[PDB]
Amino acid sequence: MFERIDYYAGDPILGLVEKFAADNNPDKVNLGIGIYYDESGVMPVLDCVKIAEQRIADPISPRPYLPMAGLPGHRKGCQELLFGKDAPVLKDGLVATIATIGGSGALKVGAEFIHEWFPQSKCYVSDPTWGNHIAIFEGCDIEVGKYPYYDTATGGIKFDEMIAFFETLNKDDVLLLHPCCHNPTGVDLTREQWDTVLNVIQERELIPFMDIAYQGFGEDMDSDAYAIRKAVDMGLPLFVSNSFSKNLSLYGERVGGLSVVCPTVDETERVFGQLNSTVRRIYSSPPSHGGRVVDIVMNDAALHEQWVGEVYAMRDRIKSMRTKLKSVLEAKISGRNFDYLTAQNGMFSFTGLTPEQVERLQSEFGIYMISNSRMCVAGLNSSNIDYVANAMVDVLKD
Amino acid sequence: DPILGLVEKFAADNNPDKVNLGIGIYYDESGVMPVLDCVKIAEQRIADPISPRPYLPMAGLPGHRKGCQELLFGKDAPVLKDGLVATIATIGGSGALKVGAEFIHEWFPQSKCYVSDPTWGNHIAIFEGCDIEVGKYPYYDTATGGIKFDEMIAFFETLNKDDVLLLHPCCHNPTGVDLTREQWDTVLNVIQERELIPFMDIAYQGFGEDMDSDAYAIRKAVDMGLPLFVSNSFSKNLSLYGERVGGLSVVCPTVDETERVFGQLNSTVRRIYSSPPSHGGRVVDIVMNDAALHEQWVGEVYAMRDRIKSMRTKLKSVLEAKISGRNFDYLTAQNGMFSFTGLTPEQVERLQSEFGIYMISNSRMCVAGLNSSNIDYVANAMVDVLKD
Ligand SMILES: *Cc1c(COP(=O)(O)O)cnc(C)c1O
Ligand SMILES: *Cc1c(COP(=O)(O)O)cnc(C)c1O
Ligand SMILES: O=C(O)[C@@H](O)Cc1c[nH]c2ccccc12
Ligand SMILES: [Mg+2]
Ligand SMILES: [Mg+2]
C-alpha cells in the first residue's frame, strides 16, 4: 500500500538546524540557516514587532477568516515597501497584491498562476539558487532550468554568458531573479548590469519573477528594490514575491506577499481575482497574527520608522562582521584573497570551501554551513568570531 | 465564493431586522464570534514573554501534531502507541486537504476523488486544483430529507481500487444530516472490500455529540486497519478561523510505511509553503497539551454544541406549535451548525425579500446565527412562508 512511497532524503537547510540543536558543543556556531542573530548570538524580537504584538494582545480579538488576499494594510505595506510610497504604479492601481505564507507561499501561488495561464512557459533559476526555488516550481509541473549566473571560477557573475542565455529563450519564459542579496552566493548585479538584463527581458518578452527576501540587508530599502522599480518603470509584466521572515525577524509567522504588475486596472482586477482563486485552492486564507504584525508595523508611522532603523542595524551588524572576519582572516592566511567577504551583500557569502572543508568545520569545530560553502554571516558575533577565523584557517592549511 | 454573493445580497438588504443564516461561522448568544477563554488564556501565555520566532518544523510543532493525534484517535490509542500515523500541522483543514490531495496525486495518479452530494464547496476546488478528476457520490435525498443510503453504497461498489472518498465523520456540511453507526459500519466495509481510500474531513468535532462519538467513523476505520487519511480543523471548535490551524493524519500498516509517508508529507509542505504558522500552532499546542485547558476547552465546545441544539429545539417547538403534518424531528436529528431546512428555493427567496432572513437557496441555514434576539423573528417568519 505505502511500500511504494520513497524515503524523503530531508531538507538540506532545515535538517541542519536540528543537527546544530542536537549537537552539544560549548562553542557551537550556526552559519547554516538564513536567520539573523544579535551580538549576544540569539534570534532577536524587534522592538517594533514587540509593540505590535502587545497591541494584538490588548485586547484579544475574535478571529474571523482574513480575506483570501490577506489584510488591506498588509497588502499596502508590501506594495509601498517594494514600489515606493506614492508610486505612480500604485496610484494607477496597476499592481495586484496578496498576503502570502511567507515568500515561499508567494512563490507557490505565483508559479501556480504561471502554470495555469502560461502552460508552455519554462522557468529558469540562477546557477546556483536557493534550493527551494527549484522544488516550488517543479511542484507546479513547470519545467525548470538554470541560467549561468555565478562564475564559480572567479566569484563574480558570468554576465555575457547569462545575457547570451536569455537571448535564446522563448516568449513568456520565466526568469527567477534575486533583486539583491543573492542566495546563496551573496554576489549581486550592479545597477548597470540590471539595466542590460531588464532590456533583454523586454526585447525577448520574458516574464520577470523577482524573489526578494532581504530588502534592507543589501544597501537600503529603496536601493535594494532597484531591480523591481526599474522593471516597473520599463513597463514589464512583473511578478514579485517578498518575505518579511528576515527583516521583520518573524520567520515562524509566515509573512510575505505576492505582487503582479499589470498593463491595466481591469487586468489587475482579473489577475487579483485569479490570485484569490489560487489561494482558495491551496489554503483558503492566510494567518491572522502575522498579517496583523505586518499591518501594524508597516502602517504606523513610528513603528515603520523604528523598523527601518532596526533592519539597518541588522544590515550594519552583518557588514561589520564581514570586515571583522576579513581582517582577522587576512592576518592568518597570506596565500589567499578574502575580498569576497566585503564584496558580497546580504546574509550569505560563498566561502569557496570544498564540501570536505565544510564538513570538517562541522565535525571538529561545531561550525555549520551548507555543503556548497554558503555561510550565513549573521551567525557571527564578537564572541565567536576569533573562533571561526581560527577554525577556517586550520581547515584551509589542511 | 458563492457564499460571498449571498453576503453581498445580505449587506445590500436595508431591512434592519435582517438575519444572516448563510454565514459559515459560529456566533454566541450575543450574535458575535466568541473568543474562547482557553484561547484567551493561551494567547496571554504566548504574549508574555514575547519569544523569538524561529521556523517551525515543516510538520509543525510536536505538540500540535500530538494534540491532533490524541483528539482524533483517542488518548493513547494503540495506533499511536504503535507509531502507525503520520501527522503534520497544516494551514487549517483546507491546507490539510491540499497536502493530502497532492500526496494522493503524486503517488496514486490514477485515483479519482468522490465527494458527497452535496458537500463543502472547496472540497471540489481543492482536489481539482491538484489535477484530480473529481466526481460526486449520492448522499442527500431531497425527498426524504435524509441519506440515499442504498444508492450511495451502490455507487461505492462501481469504483476502482485506490479511488478516494471524501467523508464527513459527523456534522455534515452543508446538510447536518449524518450517517448512523450502523450506516458507517457498512460504508467502511464497502471501502475495505473495494480497497478505496477513506479521506475523512472533520471540522466540527464536538458540535455533534461529543469528541469521542464525533470521531467514531475515524476510530472504526483505524480498527478495521484501513488506509485512512484524516484532515482536521480547529477553525470552528477553537474559534480560530483566521490563525489557520488544522492537521493532516495518515494511518499506515507499518512503522516503516509511516516514515515514508511522513517524509513525503514533509516534502509536500516544502513545495507549498515551507513550514506552518507559529502563533496558531502554539495555541493548539497549549490548549491540547495542557490538561486543565483541554478540559476547559472541551467544556466551551460543548457549551457551543448545546447552544446550537438549544436553538434547534426552540425553532422546532415554535414550528410544531403551528404546523402538524410535517415531521420536524430532522431539525433535531441533524448535527453541527448546518441545517438543510428542506425549504424550496422559492421559499428561501420569499424569506429573503419579505424578512431579510438569508439562507442558501439549497435550504441551508447556519443554526449558530440564531440566538435569543432573533429566534422568534426567524421561527415566525418561517411559519408564514410554509403557510403561504
Ligand atoms: C529564505 C528565502 C525564502 C523563504 O522566505 P520565507 O518567508 O521563509 O517563506 C525565499 N526566497 C529566498 C531567496 C530566501 O532566501
Ligand atoms: C470549515 C471546513 C473545512 C475547512 O476548515 P478550515 O480550518 O477553515 O480550513 C473543511 N471541511 C469542512 C466540512 C468544513 O466545514
Ligand atoms: O535560506 C535559508 O537560509 C533558509 O531561509 C531556507 C529555509 C528555511 N526554512 C526552509 C524550509 C524549506 C526549505 C528551505 C528553508
Ligand atoms: Mg499543482
Ligand atoms: Mg491599522
Numbering used by the authors:
A (entry chain A): 1 to 398
B (entry chain B): 11 to 398
What did the authors write?
The psychrophilic aromatic aminotransferase from Psychrobacter sp. B6 is a representative of pyridoxal phosphate (PLP)-dependent enzymes. PsyArAT exhibits an activity typical for ArAT: transamination, which is a transfer of an amine group between aromatic α-amino acids and α-ketoacids. These competitive inhibitors are bound in the active center of PsyArAT but do not undergo transamination reaction, which makes them an outstanding tool for examination of the enzyme catalytic center.
Interestingly, in the active site of monomer A and C in the PsyArAT/WOH complex, the presence of a big, hydrophobic indole group of the WOH molecule, just near the Arg280* residue, prevented its contact with the Asn132 side chain (which was pushed away from the active pocket).
